[PDB]
Design a binder for this molecule. Sequence first.
Ligand SMILES: OC[C@H]1O[C@@](CO)(O[C@H]2O[C@H](CO)[C@@H](O)[C@H](O)[C@H]2O[C@H]2O[C@H](CO)[C@@H](O)[C@H](O)[C@H]2O[C@H]2O[C@H](CO)[C@@H](O)[C@H](O)[C@H]2O)[C@@H](O)[C@@H]1O
Ligand SMILES: OC[C@H]1O[C@@](CO)(O[C@H]2O[C@H](CO)[C@@H](O)[C@H](O)[C@H]2O[C@H]2O[C@H](CO)[C@@H](O)[C@H](O)[C@H]2O[C@H]2O[C@H](CO)[C@@H](O)[C@H](O)[C@H]2O)[C@@H](O)[C@@H]1O
Ligand code: UDP
Ligand code: UDP
Lengths: 343, 341
Amino acid sequence: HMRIAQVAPLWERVPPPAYGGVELVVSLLTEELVKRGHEVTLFASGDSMTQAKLVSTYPHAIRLDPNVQEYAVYEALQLGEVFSRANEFDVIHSHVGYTALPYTSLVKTPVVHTLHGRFTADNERIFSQYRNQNYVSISHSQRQLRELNYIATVYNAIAVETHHFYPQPSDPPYLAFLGRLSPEKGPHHAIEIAKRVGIPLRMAGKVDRVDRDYFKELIEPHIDGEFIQFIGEADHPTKNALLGGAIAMLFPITWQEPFGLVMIESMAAGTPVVAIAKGAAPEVIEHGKTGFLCHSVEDCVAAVAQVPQLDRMACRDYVWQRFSVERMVSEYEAVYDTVLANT
Amino acid sequence: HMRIAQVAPLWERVPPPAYGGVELVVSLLTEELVKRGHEVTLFASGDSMTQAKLVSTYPHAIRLDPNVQEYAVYEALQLGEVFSRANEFDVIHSHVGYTALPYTSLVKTPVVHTLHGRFTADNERIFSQYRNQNYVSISHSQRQLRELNYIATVYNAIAVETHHFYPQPSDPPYLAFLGRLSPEKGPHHAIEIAKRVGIPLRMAGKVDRVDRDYFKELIEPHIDGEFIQFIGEADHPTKNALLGGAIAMLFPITWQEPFGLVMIESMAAGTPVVAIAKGAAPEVIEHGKTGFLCHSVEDCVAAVAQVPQLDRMACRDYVWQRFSVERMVSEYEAVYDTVLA
Ligand SMILES: OC[C@H]1O[C@@](CO)(O[C@H]2O[C@H](CO)[C@@H](O)[C@H](O)[C@H]2O[C@H]2O[C@H](CO)[C@@H](O)[C@H](O)[C@H]2O[C@H]2O[C@H](CO)[C@@H](O)[C@H](O)[C@H]2O)[C@@H](O)[C@@H]1O
Ligand SMILES: OC[C@H]1O[C@@](CO)(O[C@H]2O[C@H](CO)[C@@H](O)[C@H](O)[C@H]2O[C@H]2O[C@H](CO)[C@@H](O)[C@H](O)[C@H]2O[C@H]2O[C@H](CO)[C@@H](O)[C@H](O)[C@H]2O)[C@@H](O)[C@@H]1O
Ligand SMILES: O=c1ccn([C@@H]2O[C@H](COP(=O)(O)OP(=O)(O)O)[C@@H](O)[C@H]2O)c(=O)[nH]1
Ligand SMILES: O=c1ccn([C@@H]2O[C@H](COP(=O)(O)OP(=O)(O)O)[C@@H](O)[C@H]2O)c(=O)[nH]1
């Protein structure tokens, strides 16, 4: 019974064929919001696929589009389209970060900001000046600016039914890395863990413009093609066979992870996660059940020997209980009611 | 009789100590408007030097600041500052490009956009949706979108009096390159021109992040230290001694130049410019009088033999005639009167 605007980043298609975290959450939230009888307008790339109304300022995803050199041009276009149509919505749900804060004070329509990212020394200055705005975090450890007006915590979710469940891992063992080849994800840790335990590592993910040197210096020289394998950017079927076949997924972040969708994607396939207890990993993994929280590489190596002790169906059942779209969208519906009443 | 907001980019100090084109133009325009009794508010870095009211969202210039990795935070910060107080000005004069267009439709106060940059395959799309807004070009050749509502063309200007005049170049001749070490300025062309004529080249400019590969593999291996010299970003006194001592300044652009402040800075020093005729070079150089418009490297080499044929004092007077702060500011004042009615 609401008019809702979903403003997505333009780097990826809202249902992204391969890499894409924020866009994927926007997809799940938007489709379920439409099923619940709301009039939803989605602001996203032109190739996006939604049953809501799609208003786009570019036909394709920006990251892998070769004709685009200035992402900010189309980012500003869609920001101008949204807030200049502010009277056609009851609430604006923005997912594009701080670039929407200076527009929010200029329109009557209340705006909800879902924080999808780490806090940095720079962005804290702009969030501080707009402290009295409606923010929603995706984990508790993310709230490093305890002066912002946090309306609620809404954990992210995946579509568990669309992930195939694997009862037992592949017959010759192998570990899995899934994610962008970034130091923040620590694929260098994953490679070192693999031959310390003697178990091969299969990796999937993109190597985008900012990590080419890092991949070039620390990741590429270790890729055998046999013990260390790199398939590159994987689509949904590819990553599901990647995670499902592994005894465990290595998540050795060196970073203040806000959430980590690949963790709940690994558990949905029935594969537990060996992660480092940074960021939101303690809130996502139940230690000694759906994975192991570790505080060093040697802890991760010691934990890999204890991953067959886990019940794999409990991993999938865990994802159903906490990270389903049903719960997430219902929690976002509770946010919209709060913002539209406590104005 | 106006309250005017000057919105500057944050990469450089509004009076930039060294590199900085757009920021320098905002400085001259802002100070002169304050002299003429306009109540000016300048939005810029905190170390800027102005007689207007200064509102800053970061204390220093970001480009050489090592603590900043996200320029967009402070750019968005000051954009929010302007339009949250947009009700306090009669005219907003933006110099920050397309990032301010979506704000213009949200406020009553009219906004004038001075275009400081080339048109691109991407940025044309955002200017197109905001075609009916108040734009000002800094050259006519820059108007590659003949559908925009250009209020006027206002050529840029420098403070000619602050540039020392050189009657005669340095005793052993040398040519000069001044500008960012970018392929858009073609310093590789300048080096090739340099030993084609028998005259050494002293070069000045910044080498920023996007051109390090260009500099490392195309420029740096040729820096002799004797025939080719690179002084590495010059401040105002050094760069003017660089131009004044040269027989001519090489301006070998490969690019749709919006203006080119180093040209009128070179002529102000009394040094004529041998440039290639792309972008605004025909409108800035008077061919055969204060320099030579060329269409190849070939031509630039031929022009170096005919630069003593030019009168150096006429070059300084030329900048006084066309690119003075007095003329530019009055035309921008006519734009403000135009936009306010
Ligand atoms: O300066 C902060 C610091 O953190 C990064 C990522 O480590 O910034 C990310 O966080 C916010 C919002 O998530 C945005 O400012 C950035 O866009 C985002 O990083 C994206 O850009 C880098 C490349 O610079 C990519 O590798 C990441 O994959 C991007 O992550 C987000 O963007 C995509 C597309 O929207 C989403 O699918 C993804 O879920 C997001 O996490 C760094 O930029 C920076 O070092
Ligand atoms: O796709 C556009 C293409 O062209 C550049 C210039 O090479 O873009 C410039 O034009 C607009 C507005 O001027 C902006 O997109 C850019 O900010 C501007 O280029 C600046 O950034 C590059 C680094 O990529 C620098 O070398 C230039 O020095 C910058 O040029 C302007 O910015 C400074 C400070 O704001 C001014 O002092 C200067 O006078 C301006 O020319 C490319 O950036 C882009 O790739
Ligand atoms: O090769 C890849 C690498 C990543 N992803 C997906 O992109 C999303 C990344 O979200 P995450 O939070 O885990 O990483 P981040 O956004 O922080 O870079 C996840 O849904 C991944 O399944 C993918 O499909 N293929
Ligand atoms: O070492 C340098 C190199 C450049 N500049 C100044 O930076 C400005 C650049 O303006 P221009 O239009 O010529 O180049 P662009 O802005 O287009 O890159 C000029 O005023 C130069 O005098 C400088 O002070 N020192």
